[PDB]
Swiss-Prot record:
Disulfide bonds: none
Domain of life, source organism: Eukaryota
Keywords: Blood coagulation, Glycoprotein, Hemostasis, Heparin-binding, Protease inhibitor, Secreted, Serine protease inhibitor, Signal
Subcellular location: Secreted
Effect of K197A: No change in rates of factor Xa inhibition
Single GO MF annotation: serine-type endopeptidase inhibitor activity
Name of the protein in its database record: Protein Z-dependent protease inhibitor
Carbohydrate-modified residues: N14, N117, N211, N232
Site residues, Essential for interaction with PROZ: Y198, D251
Principal cellular location given in the protein's record: secreted
Marked site positions, Reactive bond: Y338, S339
Gene that encodes the chain: Serpina10
Keyword check for Nucleotide-binding: no
Record family assignment: Belongs to the serpin family.
Length: 372
């Protein structure tokens, strides 16, 4: 009897989702390939920061994250929600989610005791002092905390460190959940995957003929397929028709649009071909966050006085998210039937959305162009 807090998180979630879609839009401008990031995880780090700021710095972050109506709720409501949404997920044995965060600040700056405890309590972020001026060393300790606290999963996250750096925030999300309905591994065979009209590769393609839930958006001419996980998490697979451009969809992704897809879902006996793959991708986010209006946090004008009262020197140097998605066969131990089933065959680039259903929180948003 503590599920009701996920259900109240639906507003934080919906605003964090919008932020996620605005960011994917921004990413979409800067580069051409695979994309994965966790709007949820990133907004833990950004909200933790937000509480450390004031003035325009804070205002920009509230507006950049769409959390203005929740920052007007009172000082401890946002942190109290994040504490609960994280802990509920975290303690869910049947959810295949691992999430965490790190902060690394230069020894020059003392952390105000209030913000230190607040950060560690609500957001589970410990601000660790580090001597960046010896980066050879600095990278060692940084990479050691991460690989240790993530029990081996995130080894050697930084290959290089700038000695000038003042403050680094690191978020990570790892997801590898079991399907409610498993793919039989013996149906997985190599299959063509079309990168474009000219290049195709081979991928290991999982297959199942069974009960599937999807819907078809007539405006965009794409299928939206639900692949349920254990632990009340679902992946929506968004596949367009060859004729159209999957990149165009990103201009139009909104919380409303996705809600409309969910409401028209129906369960059909269907043939599904879905490739098994793994995305492991680390993202430098600050320069994108700049693009979304969060500029003063990363400048010398930054107001971080609630984090450390001493210096106008201080600013956020880097914000990194490390994302890991792992998709394979592994699963858990009224239907429209045609005479012979239709098929959704995901053998060209597509978008995925992994969301937790009670919360409607967006665990991973991404674009898969060249599977790995």
């Amino acid at each position: 009897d503590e599920e009701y807090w996920l259900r109240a998180s639906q507003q934080l979630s919906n605003e964090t989702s919008s932020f996620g879609f605005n960011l994917l839009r921004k990413i979409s401008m800067r580069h051409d390939g695979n994309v994965i990031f966790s709007p949820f995880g990133l907004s833990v780090a950004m909200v933790n920061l937000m509480l450390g700021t004031k003035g325009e710095t804070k205002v920009q972050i509230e507006n950049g994250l769409n959390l203005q109506a929740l920052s007007q709720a009172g000082p401890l409501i946002l942190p109290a929600l994040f504490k609960k949404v994280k802990e509920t997920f975290s303690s869910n044995r049947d959810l295949g989610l691992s999430q965490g965060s790190f902060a690394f600040i230069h020894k020059d700056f003392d952390i105000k005791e209030t913000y230190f405890n607040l950060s560690k309590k609500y957001f589970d972020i410990e601000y660790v002092s580090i001597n960046f001026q010896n980066s050879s060393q600095a990278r060692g300790l940084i990479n050691h905390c991460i690989v240790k606290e993530t029990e081996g999963k995130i080894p050697k996250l930084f290959d290089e460190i700038n000695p000038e750096t003042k403050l680094i925030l690191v978020d990570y999300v790892l997801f590898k959940g079991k399907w409610l309905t498993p793919f039989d591994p013996s149906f997985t065979e190599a299959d063509t995957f079309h990168l474009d009209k000219y290049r195709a590769i081979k991928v290991p393609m999982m297959y199942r003929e069974g009960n599937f839930t999807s819907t078809f958006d007539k405006k965009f001419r794409c299928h939206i397929l639900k692949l349920p996980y254990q632990g009340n998490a679902t992946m929506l697979v968004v596949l367009m028709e060859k004729t159209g451009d999957y990149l165009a969809l990103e201009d139009y992704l909104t919380v409303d649009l996705v809600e409309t897809w969910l409401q028209n879902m129906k369960t059909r006996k269907m043939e599904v071909f879905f490739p098994k793959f793994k995305l492991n991708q680390r993202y430098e986010m600050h320069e994108l966050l700049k693009q979304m209006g969060i500029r003063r946090l990363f400048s010398t004008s930054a107001d971080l006085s609630e984090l450390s009262a001493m210096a106008r020197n201080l600013q956020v140097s880097r914000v990194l998210q490390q994302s890991v998605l792992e998709v394979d066969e592994r699963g858990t131990e009224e239907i429209i039937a045609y005479s012979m089933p239709p098929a959704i065959k995901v053998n060209r680039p597509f978008h995925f959305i992994i969301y937790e259903e009670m919360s409607r929180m967006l665990l991973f948003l991404g674009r898969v162009v060249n599977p790995t």
